[PDB]
Amino acid sequence: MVTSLIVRLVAWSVRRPVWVVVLSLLIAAFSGVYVARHFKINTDISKLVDAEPQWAALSQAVDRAFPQRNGTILAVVEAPAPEFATAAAHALTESLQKQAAAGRIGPVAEPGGGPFFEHNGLLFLSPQQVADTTSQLASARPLVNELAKNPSLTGLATTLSTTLGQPLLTGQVKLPSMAKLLSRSAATVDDVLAGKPAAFSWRALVDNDAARQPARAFVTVQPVVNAQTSDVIRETARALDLEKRYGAVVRLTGEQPLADDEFSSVEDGAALNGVVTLLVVFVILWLALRSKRMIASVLVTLFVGLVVTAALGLAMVGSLNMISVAFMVLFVGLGVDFSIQYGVKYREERFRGEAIDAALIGAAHSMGMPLALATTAVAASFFSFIPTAYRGVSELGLIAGVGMFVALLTTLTLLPALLRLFAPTPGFPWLAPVDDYLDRHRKPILIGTLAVVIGALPLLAFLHFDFNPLHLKDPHSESMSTLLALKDSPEAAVNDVTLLAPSLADADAAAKRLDALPEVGRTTTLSTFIPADQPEKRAAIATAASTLLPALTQPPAPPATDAQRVAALKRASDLLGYAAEDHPGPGAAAAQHLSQSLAKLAAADSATRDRAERAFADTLRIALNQLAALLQPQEITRDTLPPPLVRDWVAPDGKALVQISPKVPKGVDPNDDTMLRHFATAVKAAEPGAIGGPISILHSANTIISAFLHAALWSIISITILLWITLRRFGDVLRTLVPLLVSGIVTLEMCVVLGMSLNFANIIALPLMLGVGVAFKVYFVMAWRAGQTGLLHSSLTHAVLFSAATTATAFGSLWLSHHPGTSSMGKLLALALTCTLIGAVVFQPVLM
């Protein structure tokens, strides 16, 4: 039946050889040009996995109401001080605004604090903290008065030594109270002396308590309505030289730059890794059949089928997405096996004494239904993902599956043709001690390994899974690295889900509903930008401003010369030592540490003293500018908010989206499914419309989890029925199935032993290894069909591991892909190929 059609198709192809080559090359030429017409690649994360129309409408609501929300970029400005970070964002925000007005990018806005928060920021506090801060600030009038008159370095050492001489004696100020200022000042000066960059963050030493090391400032760039936005922010920040002036760095992230870094890890070295993979195949191909004229004929059919696969694949998938690109390596890994398994047989037919076309048609009866069993089995594991909403894998299985058939059809028509036009002692003594041990002890070794896998069966208890898709995104990329640092920042709404409400009145009642949950914590509406009771706070701030603003706005200072600078530095260093020895205690240790730094600073140079000044005076002049703005607040009403601030929270309609900043406490990273799954499943149980962040990700996992679960079940049914139709004996269906079970546990059992938890792209390989697992049982059973002699000798000569060396060369190519998403798949495909090969050599009695 099936074996008669093949020798008929070979006889046809071997009767008319020249007609095949000119028809294949013509179809290969038509298929080659066909590839270039519409070779399009999609890198959107939304086409890897599909979602039901319920989840699609919710994600379409928040997007269609706020079309800007998705494509916004998040620029992270990072400087050695909050003052230099805030001042750098302002420089960057201003030059970005100029192009936005020209239509190059969309509205530029900074969340942490634009001109709106810089002035009215003191109003957002609680009502009691304001009157307390105005009380501290009003009493700080003589201190801020001395700082505004001379912000210069010499003016700081002057107001320092002035305090370190008489106030300590008078009893008005004490030494341990300054130790909070001196120690940080001493640590700041020591950094300036060491040469490494630092800056005295005047804000962190007084009003603020959090002295987090890498101070940062954020500025968002919404997209245009119609080089695009990600290139503009790179040019302006380069032209501004605000990295050289303010000491900041511009790091950008967002919806779209994340996805383009994903595919950036795919193409990285792919040209080098693709060509070095074919060389390994070439060396393995020559090791099988060793004849330069046969290898050429094999590599020609491999190229033709690969082109027809890419042509027939592009037609039915349109886009070649990030996950669907692996079909290229899999074709060259598996399709050559057909040419390896058949070519080495013809080489043996030629060896035994047969010649010419008899050897070619003779190998068509041996490798007849075997090469049709393997091809239909591998394609069945590819097709097993087709009926699933996992388009990334579904497209892969569609291209590779039909690619397996055309590859087999290529091996049956084109390869016998070239082996006709062109045409051409094993000796392996190193298998001797192994096959001696094996064939003498293959009886207890089987029971040995079988008892082991049942003993390690409870290792699968700790077979842990991985749930957050951030672990397969390459963390050392520029887009992923900045996102992971914004976990602690509340203004980087990176872990927030969005819920669209029918009004701002509804959203405030929903945000109050969500705040009742223990997972939620921070909720923000547009009303969150309307503080509670502003009249009280303005009444206290204005009184503090009645005494501070006269003291904060002093005339400038004369640029003191160099000799006067060292004078006040030595003067400030000398009055500390006497202050530390006359009044000992905890502050004396801090005061005496500053004496050494100032003395070393005064005896350094003038360029380094200008550095320390720019690290003490400059950051003071920036900090003083902020206090005056904070003391001057206006009235806040819904119609007194900036126009862009309302468009980002209430669209020109009645859509007030609620962003739920989940509780940001200290512990593990947020992306772990510990609290972010608890938050995403509780805030979804409350408000069912909530979608976007942790919720849209959690629903993505359950869509991927139920995705491969069917395909694995789809494989064995489509493969078991496949083995019953061909092999009608049920005694052989039970044959090939048992090692599939043993091969399937040992891999899972190895993932515990080696320590490689299953993830989302990694798990794709579990269903595929059923079609390839029975494709190598078919290969092996032919190498040992001669006899039970040397299992390694037979398979070496009959070239089954020469097909495994090519298939493992395929999986080895995906293993070295830099991208941890695909590289976790290749590590599974290679681990399951090794458990298959060892699973066949060991289980010869059960299988044959």
Next chain:
Amino acid sequence: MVTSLIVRLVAWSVRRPVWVVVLSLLIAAFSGVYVARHFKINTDISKLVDAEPQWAALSQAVDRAFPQRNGTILAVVEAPAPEFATAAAHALTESLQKQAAAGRIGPVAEPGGGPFFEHNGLLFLSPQQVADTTSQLASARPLVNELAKNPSLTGLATTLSTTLGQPLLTGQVKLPSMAKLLSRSAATVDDVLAGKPAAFSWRALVDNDAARQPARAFVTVQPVVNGAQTSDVIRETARALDLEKRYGAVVRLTGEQPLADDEFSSVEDGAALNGVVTLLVVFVILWLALRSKRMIASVLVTLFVGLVVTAALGLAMVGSLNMISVAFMVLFVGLGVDFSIQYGVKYREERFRGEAIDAALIGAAHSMGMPLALATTAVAASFFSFIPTAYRGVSELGLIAGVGMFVALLTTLTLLPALLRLFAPPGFPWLAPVDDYLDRHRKPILIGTLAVVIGALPLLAFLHFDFNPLHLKDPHSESMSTLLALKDSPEAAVNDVTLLAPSLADADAAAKRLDALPEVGRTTTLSTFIPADQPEKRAAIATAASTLLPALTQPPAPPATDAQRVAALKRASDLLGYAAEDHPGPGAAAAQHLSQSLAKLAAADSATRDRAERAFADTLRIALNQLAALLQPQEITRDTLPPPLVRDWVAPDGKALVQISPKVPKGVDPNDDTMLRHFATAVKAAEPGAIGGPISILHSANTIISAFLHAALWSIISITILLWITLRRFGDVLRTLVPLLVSGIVTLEMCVVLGMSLNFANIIALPLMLGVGVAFKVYFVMAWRAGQTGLLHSSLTHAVLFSAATTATAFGSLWLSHHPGTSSMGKLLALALTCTLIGAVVFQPVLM
């Protein structure tokens, strides 16, 4: 030739039956008395699982330096209000303090605040906070002057309406500022009218921290250095103190020992009834197998004789019966009666197949010698597999049960034949449809299940362990229910690790170093009881004391009459209604809410007014009492700390002790190993000497896993070699080993499907089922000698089903136990038994 040796034991047992009954009864008599003299049971958690001296000397280092620290039992005092909570703890502490001196219990101290913390409370705040809290209190003097003079419901409503009258009109005070005061007032008043517990807490409104609604107070007693013990002594005082009902509080006890003995209580909720109802089920199964009164009675006697000599040998070689090892007798009844079920009915058929009494006993001993000697040695091997492991809870159970299996076989081979010949005593139609479908369609059903199992292999990826042992404990006893709610309280410090340092100056170096790690939160040495550097706050609080304390100490106002109260309540209710409509705002809606509640209150009874007064005025008494005590701080010398404080932190040897309370996320999980095992590995890595809470638990799991994992591997190496020796030929060892692999996955695959996690007692059954798995493959293979077809018929009329029903009755009894550790094991043993039964029937063509 054990079959010949076995008949030697039986032919001797027959002919002289009186020699057996008398000798075995004496052994049971000698054994029964031995079971009475020894019956020790230790409930400590440490006897179950062991550890090397590193985790044993560090445990003893802290214990030796602080012997009192272990047995201290926590006593939570929860009341409707914080002031009612602390006032009930004070009554509880001083009554416990009397009996501590009497030698009944050890020293009684309250961690939250005794007279020490109550007076120096403000000295522990941050320097800026207390200087600000001092200014707030000082200006609130006219309010407390009105409150201290009239802590009475009439004086409350009078101070309310007085403020609403003129200060609201003149602009002195504003109505929205009282919205928080008026709201919780109206909330409290409505509670008094509703009848549920109410108590206006002046803490949760003035300081406005809004502490948790179930306000808690803690008092710890230690055990005596050398009558009912300390756990009941606390329950006796607060029961007879009666004021705990008046103060509104209930005391609940959690400790190290009062929590461990509640677990043993959860083992015997209705276990005595569970034990006897188990025998009644086995009794009906025994009749269904060998339906004759004399054969049932004969088996029940030899069952008890083996049960008592096993219980005697068990104590004579383990002594202890920890709650993991206590579940051996239900396993004996379930698994020991199986031997008397196989031999009892083989005799019954062979006797009914045309033989005499002496022939049937001896003929049944011939054809069941090697089988019953195989199953016995096989089940014993799974128990013994836990012997060489540091998991004594199972090592003891495995020891007693294993020595009992050999005894059970020996009891069936000698005693049962003796009793049987002295006393002396198969058509099922409903199997026809199922046996027909099975026997005619065995070919594809086997391929069907062996396919489905291979496809459900990726399900094992979501098999999840449960690393913490708290889910294993009963969550509805008093001790466990108490400890679970203590996650919020920091001074409870329920999950702290204890590091023992040489000196306090050195312990301060470790405590202040551990604070650098991200998940460390708080550290407490004795030096953290020397609060900060606050002689300045002594002067600040003194200033507030100069004006507040004179206003605090007022002469007790005369008790207002009954007529004036409703007059004063309506005066406050009628002024609230006008306050809301004349001067409106956000607090006007709250002021209107209180007006209705006051009017409803002022028209109910004269007992409900004193009722709400005991919730408002009897509370103002306490709050004002705390304000006076808080304003008198005294000094912070290391010698001001009381003697118990120094003893509970600095050892007499000079050793200081650091408690590390992990950083408390505001989020969710209080028990998941995500952050508590993170804090257990970061603190253990930084400070290796750490031990106690999470570290002693996390290390306890990894030694259970290692002890458990080896037992599974040790089970098959025991069974496989036992199958190599007894069963000759590799074709029969592989015949029964492959279905062991199949059943092992289907159970784990069911834990994924059903949703059963794998814990620490649940996991004991995985190695135990390798022995039970082959014991029924030995039973089934005998049932299918005569009737290899009609295998559901044959398995019924050949004992296997009636044998599996007694085994499931053993596993069913453990399922009904209240202890979730034991119960989770009983659910795994049943699911693994229900998979090996179906695993043998479906996989019939694999064996005979």
